[PDB]
Amino acid sequence: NKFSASTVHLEHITTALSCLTPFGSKDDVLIFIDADGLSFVRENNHVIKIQLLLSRELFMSYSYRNETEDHMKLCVKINHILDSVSVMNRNSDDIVECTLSYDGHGSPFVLIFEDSFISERVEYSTYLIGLELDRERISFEAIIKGEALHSALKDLKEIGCKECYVYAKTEANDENVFALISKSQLGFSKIKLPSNRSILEKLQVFDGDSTTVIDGFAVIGFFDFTSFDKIRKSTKIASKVLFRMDVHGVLSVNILSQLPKDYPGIVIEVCMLEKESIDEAAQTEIELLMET
Amino acid sequence: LSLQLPWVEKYRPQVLSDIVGNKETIDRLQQIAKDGNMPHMIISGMPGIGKTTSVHCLAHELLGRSYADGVLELNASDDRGIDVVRNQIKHFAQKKLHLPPGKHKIVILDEADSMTAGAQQALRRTMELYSNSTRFAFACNQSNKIIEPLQSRCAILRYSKLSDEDVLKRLLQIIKLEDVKYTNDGLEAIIFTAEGDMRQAINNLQSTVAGHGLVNADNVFKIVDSPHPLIVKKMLLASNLEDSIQILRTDLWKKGYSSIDIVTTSFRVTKNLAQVKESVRLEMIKEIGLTHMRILEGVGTYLQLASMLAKIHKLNNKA
Amino acid sequence: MKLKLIVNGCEAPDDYKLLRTTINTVASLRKTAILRFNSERLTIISTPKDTGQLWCTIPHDVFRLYTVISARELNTITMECNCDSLLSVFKRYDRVMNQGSSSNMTIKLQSPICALGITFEEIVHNKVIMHSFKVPVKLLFRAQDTRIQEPMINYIQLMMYKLPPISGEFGSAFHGFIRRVERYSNVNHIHLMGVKVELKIIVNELDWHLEICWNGPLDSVISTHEVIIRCKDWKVCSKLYAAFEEVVLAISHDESCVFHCSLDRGRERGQIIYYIARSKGL
Amino acid sequence: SFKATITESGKQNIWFRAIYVLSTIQDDIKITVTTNELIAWSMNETDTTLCQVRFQKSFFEEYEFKPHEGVQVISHKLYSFRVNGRHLTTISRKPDGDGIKSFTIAVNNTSTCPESLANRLIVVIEMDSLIVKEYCPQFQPIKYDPIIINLKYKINYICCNSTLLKNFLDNCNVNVTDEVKLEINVHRLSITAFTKAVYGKNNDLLRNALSMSNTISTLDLEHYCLFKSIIFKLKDFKNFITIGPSWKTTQDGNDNISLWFCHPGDPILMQMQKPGVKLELVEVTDSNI
Amino acid sequence: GEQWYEKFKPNCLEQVAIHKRKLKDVQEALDAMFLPNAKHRILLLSGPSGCSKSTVIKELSKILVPKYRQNSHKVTEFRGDCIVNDLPQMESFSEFLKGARYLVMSNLSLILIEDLPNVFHIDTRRRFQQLILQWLYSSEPLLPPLVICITECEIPENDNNYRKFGIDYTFSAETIMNKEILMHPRLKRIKFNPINSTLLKKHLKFICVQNMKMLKEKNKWNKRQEVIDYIAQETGDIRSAITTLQFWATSSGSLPISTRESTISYFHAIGKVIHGSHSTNNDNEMINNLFENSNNLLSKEDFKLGILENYNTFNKGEFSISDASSIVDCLSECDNMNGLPESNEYGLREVRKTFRNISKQGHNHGTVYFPREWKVRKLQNSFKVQAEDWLNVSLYKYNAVHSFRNITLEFGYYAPLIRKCQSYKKIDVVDRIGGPIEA
DNA sequence: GATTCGTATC
DNA sequence: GCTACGGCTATACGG
């Protein structure tokens, strides 16, 4: 085989793949395989993209015999992959041992599960085969704890929230405010995060050059909540969520969910586009309600 | 870089004074705007003659600053199911927004002809419940698609096709604003091709300016084509079969027009053909229907159209 | 037409669990169920007349008192009742002992459409709270009862597999093997495999394949045996396997599948049979 | 103008349950702000049931009311407004994993507030994790109608425990059962939740007749004065019963519900009491003698 | 500031635009329905929009409910847009009916179902049917009076599919209620007609004189009479007429007067195709407007069958056989075009031309009727059931496979004759299958 | 739109 | 501290 890997911590893989459940339930999923590991890149309507980073140290039998190309790309379905990694590996005495396999172009993506009592082989046929913010024009940068952001996202989901807004304004007195203004059936809904360092660990607002820390001006982000709710399940296991947005209307979410002692967690990168916001008077009401 | 609004939206009127065409209807809309007591209304007519922009301008001049949270514009692009109508329309109608003594909230329902019947009944209930605070404006192409109980509470305003003079006036305003070279023959050709459609006239003018510059008959007729209903009408009204066959070939077959399009256009023209007898009209309708059946079943060659023309001429000159 | 019975869950655990499992199975299968009250056994039937049939046999010794009298042959009282009302009554009666009690459940046929007067007692803590219920039922006619019969199974190619008891070491592993195919959302057909002992769950489709296999020890009570069945019936089979220690699986080549459950009360043994037709042909 | 804040877990629970039940009675909840209490009531579309919840001044730890600044005079000032039940019940809910340390409700109908707060109810929630979430639901001022049935009924009296009644009512299903028959014998009290049967053309069955019954002796009945059969609906009784035990107060020892009815025609009074909450339910009874 | 049809609503029964006979036989039905033992359980009102269906019930409830109410005024209108938290949408009407059933003694209130629940979804429509069926068949000793008002309007085409149902084509009582509800002993139906010209003119004159200063200021008082007559002539809707009059009065220019266009009925369209239409001597224009405004009715096989059934009523059948042959030949030709619009256009045009060419003054036409094809289909279904019985008994007592074709040809008549003599001279089926063939 | 019967009005 | 079960929610089905 051109690639082979075996793992025993199937719960981590299950949660990592379930982070993609908020996206398309039954669509395609594209997989890179290289020496560093394997990644799952998923895009929806060219407006939002998620990406996993399952490191090599997470697996204990990562081989990657491929030499013709630096990476191997395969496109398969995601739902049956989730059901395959949904073993839950119960009965701690006899741990289920997965075995991912791929033998280059034309071969199925095999997922062998061994229990020493039950043998299951799942093969998936592969199919025929962007949203990145520039690291120079960042408008604001925030580091929020995962629990608070997940609670805010869940509350926004529970109130409808057809549209959502992002507020990021720094002040000269070292006071930072971060709120999520929402359009819904209720009207104007806001969820402002605390200014303490336990939750809002860092909040820096720039002048579109990522260097000058400017104060007194607010960064506005108009995002469709259908794309915003895609990150809700990712933040559930996140320990610290890193928020970044440039002036080009691209929001990048860095999920840092810090089992093997060497692998550095699972890296989830979510990139999201910003709504055009043709109505110029909406932001006026946003800042008017923010000032009060 | 590519940043230039198309002339259709770059020159969209923002006030009721810039809308040409139905002078009486625009005057009535101005009177409503200056009075404030706007009733429930239904606006119908041909596409691109100033229905949506008239309603938007009326709402803008009727609410002004309160337009942001005093109107609710729902269209076919947005979901308009019975649940959506129920929730959103009931919440917007119940909202107690302070307004001038003669001012009311406006619920603009564009493309009302494509709304489900249950949503129409929910709209009936909402109108009967909250008629004293909000008013409903309907924009549609035909008023028959709106159910009779909804039309009972609405004042129907019908928009006629734009005349050549009003189209010429608006076009000349656009030339004077953009300062492009033009020829009177070219403007006449643009009006002739537009066929009473203002948006089509603007699109054709913009294409002519952006592709050739000076707007004459030659450039316009080299970028845009003459309306095929008129060509089909000329083909059907030919005296002898040879001329009709030559027109059909050299104007629809060499130009790249599908046979099914020709048959449908012939049916429409025969439906709206004057100076012909009823028996002749129904015989040509029957022949066009037989040809349509033959085209639909798979035989879509030029021979079928030639035979249709031959039978039409045979019935025209009798036997 | 005098039917009356008394059920005590605490006095006899195993047969009460059998009755509860039968009620749960007939409720999960489809609405309404057929209760055939023969003078020596009670048979609970769920006849959809491709979809499976459940034929459970409950002996008269299960209940504390089994007076069954009717003008029909062998005092055969056949009735159709909604499972949901009976299931709710049984859940209430189960919670009655769960909160702490030992009261009996008295059932009488009180008046073609009739109702059962399922009444029992409950004591909170030394208070008397009488729980009275009336489940509307219809009385099936004698000929209509004759139109319902247990489908016989041919033994020309049918082969038996003695599935391991769930109380044994391999029971939990076999239960996991059975439910290993239930975790897939987009599955509608399971194609079984037995060659002559292995049980293989094969789900072959356009662009994905599944090869669940059982490597543990198995017994066949005393050649390939393939039958493809729907996933919903397999869920019922998994539910029946968990509640029964003695479970027997019978596979017919491209004909049918039989899930036999037996409760050794020894005494007449209570048995549950779930006949399943093949969803489609191999 | 009006400001009330809840800073207790049980008080928030009972407030949320009352709001949810008033939403399940009618799509819009009517709230009247008095200078002594906050009354939240809801009337059915058919005007066959009525439930009112009175949160006294002791319920909140501040009740700053400034009627001088909808506004009604009866003197005591009364301010009433109409709010959406579903919108209000999705605000007062308790988030999972996050504890509401403060629930403040206010409406500042003064010249100080802008149009963004004019005719907008102000509710502010502060979680234990210091996250502040506040909403601005739309409200509509209305006129309050003080229907007098509590003074008119103060006919037999029934005071039974709410625990077994809660168990029996919650065990019922409103989909298959839609009717309550509360018969009291000179010894026993029996409440049965049944449904009448409808016969078709040729003596068919348009609807079945399921009768789930329950009978209780006189010793469990805390107080009874015959001074009798009454029939009414089921769902409203279920919700009004489930309102009460939401505020778990083991130190408080009421746990009962008081009943009042005179004839099959006149409505039945249904009352439970809390430290700072008075709960009343009115239901039109079945007039069939 | 208020709409004229709202600020000039009737305050008593005398101001309601309704015929004297209609008022009388609605009053009698409502008074009989308030009796302790009423033969009629519910009242069904059907008619076009704006025919004073809803308001007359209100004014009657203002005088009937306070009289029959016990001692210890308006209607209890169903409101469909109410979304209760613990209420599935299909259960809203059931909860409303169960709550409103408690309005008999000392709580008496008429029940007015003006806006029905969502009947365009089939599940809730069947729920509505079986819910109002239980009300009629209820064993309740006494129930509050129920009034259901259904507006007869034609549902415009929305989606393209040939699974269109009765409710999808038109919104009428026949499409909503099934045969059991409509043909029920405890159901009284009072169909309504559009408001006549006389009441419309009288009420428009009353509204005009109620605002005399505003028309005299705009000098429109002298021109009010022709406007009133023209509006009353165009439409029969009181609400549309009042709205149009308000629009004309509040105007300050020469905007032409326009009102909503009522749809043409099935028999109205049949008469228009057969006998033509007055004030329009151009057949092409009339046919074009009929196809543009009533395409849903015209584009149906029921209309061609109606023309075939009713074309002989032009002169009681007194016309040349050549015209009839031409009409039926054209219809047969149109039947082979697979439902193309050209087929309907050609058929209607040929029928109209044929009837126009032979039209003469003094003609005494006949009465048109609905096609009998549904009766033929029912008879064919009965024949199918009897033939299935014959094939079952012939395949159970013995082994004999006969085809349904042979059953209809020979075994439908010969075999009953064999079973007749065999039985009388001495199997189950003795009568001719489907009955005898007469004439 | 057509026929047939019954009223209100001129 | 772990498991079972009830409530909430997302998805497929039906007419």
Ligand SMILES: Nc1ncnc2c1ncn2[C@@H]1O[C@H](COP(=O)(O)OP(=O)(O)OP(O)(O)=S)[C@@H](O)[C@H]1O
């Ligand atoms: N009377 C008019 N005067 C000036 N511009 C007009 C007029 N009517 C249409 N237009 C132009 O047409 C474009 C938009 O027309 P719309 O009013 O949106 O079309 P419409 O009349 O609403 O038809 P539909 O049914 O919505 S496609 C803009 O570019 C307008 O400037």
Ligand SMILES: Nc1ncnc2c1ncn2[C@@H]1O[C@H](COP(=O)(O)OP(=O)(O)OP(O)(O)=S)[C@@H](O)[C@H]1O
């Ligand atoms: N003299 C009058 N007679 C009758 N209705 C009047 C009169 N003056 C004003 N109206 C109004 O005209 C409207 C007529 O509505 P109705 O016909 O009663 O309702 P409807 O019969 O249900 O019609 P739909 O089907 O609901 S559109 C009401 O809003 C009345 O208030």
Ligand SMILES: [Mg+2]
């Ligand atoms: Mg438009």
Ligand SMILES: [Mg+2]
């Ligand atoms: Mg009405």
